[PDB]
Amino acid sequence: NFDYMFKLLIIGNSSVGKTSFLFRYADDTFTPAFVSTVGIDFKVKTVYRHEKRVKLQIWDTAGLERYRTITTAYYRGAMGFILMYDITNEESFNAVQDWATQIKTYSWDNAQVILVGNKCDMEEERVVPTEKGQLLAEQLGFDFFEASAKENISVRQAFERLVDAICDKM
Amino acid sequence: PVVCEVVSEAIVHAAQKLKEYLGFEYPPSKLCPAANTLNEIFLIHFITFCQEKGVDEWLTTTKMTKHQAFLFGADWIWTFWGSDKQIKLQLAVQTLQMSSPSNPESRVEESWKKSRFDKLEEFCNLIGEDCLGLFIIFGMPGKPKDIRGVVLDSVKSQMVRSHLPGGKAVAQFVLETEDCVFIKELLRNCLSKKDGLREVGKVYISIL
Ligand SMILES: Nc1nc2c(ncn2[C@@H]2O[C@H](COP(=O)(O)OP(=O)(O)OP(=O)(O)O)[C@@H](O)[C@H]2O)c(=O)[nH]1
Ligand SMILES: [Mg+2]
Numbered sequence: 001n002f003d004y005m006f007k008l009l010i011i012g013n014s015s016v017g018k019t020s021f022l023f024r025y026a027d028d029t030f031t032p033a034f035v036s037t038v039g040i041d042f043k044v045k046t047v048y049r050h051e052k053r054v055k056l057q058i059w060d061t062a063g064l065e066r067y068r069t070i071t072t073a074y075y076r077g078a079m080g081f082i083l084m085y086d087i088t089n090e091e092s093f094n095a096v097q098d099w100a101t102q103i104k105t106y107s108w109d110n111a112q113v114i115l116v117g118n119k120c121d122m123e124e125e126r127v128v129p130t131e132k133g134q135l136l137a138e139q140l141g142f143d144f145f146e147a148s149a150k151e152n153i154s155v156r157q158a159f160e161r162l163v164d165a166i167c168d169k170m
Numbered sequence: 171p172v173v174c175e176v177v178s179e180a181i182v183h184a185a186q187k188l189k190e191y192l193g194f195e196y197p198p199s200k201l202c203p204a205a206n207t208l209n210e211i212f213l214i215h216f217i218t219f220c221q222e223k224g225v226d227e228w229l230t231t232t233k234m235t236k237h238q239a240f241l242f243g244a245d246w247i248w249t250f251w252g253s254d255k256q257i258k259l260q261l262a263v264q265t266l267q268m269s270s271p272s273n274p275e276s277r278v279e280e281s282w283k284k285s286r287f288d289k290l291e292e293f294c295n296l297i298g299e300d301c302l303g304l305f306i307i308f309g310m311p312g313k314p315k316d317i318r319g320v321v322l323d324s325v326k327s328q329m330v331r332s333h334l335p336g337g338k339a340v341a342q343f344v345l346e347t348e349d350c351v352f353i354k355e356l357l358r359n360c361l362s363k364k365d366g367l368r369e370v371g372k373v374y375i376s377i378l
Binding site for chain 2: 005007038039040041042044055057066067069070073077
């Protein structure tokens with residue numbers, strides 16, 4: 001069995017890398033084909049932190065407004081959020097404040113949030129500077145990471161930081 | 171609206187291909203093919219029919235994962251895209267085997283003790299107005315090679331008279347009902363006037 005179980009959700013605009021993020025973290029793999037998530041899905045990963053066995057039930061939400069209702073229903077009981085934008089896509093970063101207030105509206109169960117700018121391997125196509133993400137995260141009270149699901153940069157660090165934040169609030 | 175006619179032909183083709191495997195039992199046992207095997211056979215034939223007709227540009231077939239099937243009460247989802255690049259319709263299709271009578275749970279450990287019927291109804295409510303639940307019955311008691319369809323709203327309407335649980339309501343609806351609407355007659359309201367569906371009334375949907 002296990003000693004803790006944490007519900008984590010991954011939210012953000014479509015084509016931002018939420019599924020790619022989850023698959024990199026879980027299976028240590030990546031595929032460039034874009035298969036958009038229909039509604040929601042989830043994967044279970046077991047980790048060992050603070051000499052304790054922690055199970056993570058990680059939900060991959062859909063980014064399209066069409067599913068924004070159904071996805072919101074699954075914010076229930078969530079303890080952590082990975083709010084993702086794409087550093088290639090400015091619309092995704094502009095949507096961050098809306099996503100954060102959506103977290104506040106639909107769970108606010110003392111849920112810890114991590115802000116992540118994915119696709120940081122795509123420096124040639126970056127439109128959101130790192131400083132902007134740092135500033136918005138500092139304002140909202142989130143920790144911040146720029147990551148790449150393609151190259152496996154700061155994926156494990158993001159998840160571990162979320163888990164650490166959840167553990168400390170106890 | 172070409173997509174309606176081509177998808178209806180695809181449905182009838184897939185059901186006719188699937189009829190071969192319906193009514194099969196292992197030599198000593200009463201066991202039939204697994205529900206997932208039947209669903210995948212039907213889906214493979216359907217998708218191969220939508221290919222070679224060039225309509226996959228306006229239609230997406232998404233097979234639910236085991237987790238998605240358990241959560242959504244759906245076995246797959248047909249999304250119909252319009253002339254533009256916008257979603258116009260979504261059919262959440264759940265299959266049943268009524269030749270022989272339980273949902274196996276995932277490793278969820280946080281709660282989820284509802285029927286597939288209630289889960290499908292909640293999924294379609296959450297998705298929105300343009301999402302309709304559709305049951306497809308592979309085989310009935312007697313005629314094990316009979317493939318029929320029932321719109322979820324028809325069962326819901328019959329439930330205001332029967333006052334019995336939704337799964338038993340679908341079972342009662344697939345029997346007790348002789349009026350039929352052909353699958354091409356249905357789905358003619360693909361990209362417009364979603365009132366035609368969900369107001370199909372006391373009637374089952376015939377494939378062959
Ligand atoms: N270069 C690069 N490409 C990425 C990265 N992460 C994802 N992609 C690509 O970007 C696209 C987005 O992938 P997804 O993970 O499916 O996006 P999503 O957030 O799941 O989108 P929805 O399921 O609709 O909500 C895919 O084509 C990936 O191949 C990344 O870190 N670097
Ligand atoms: Mg996805």
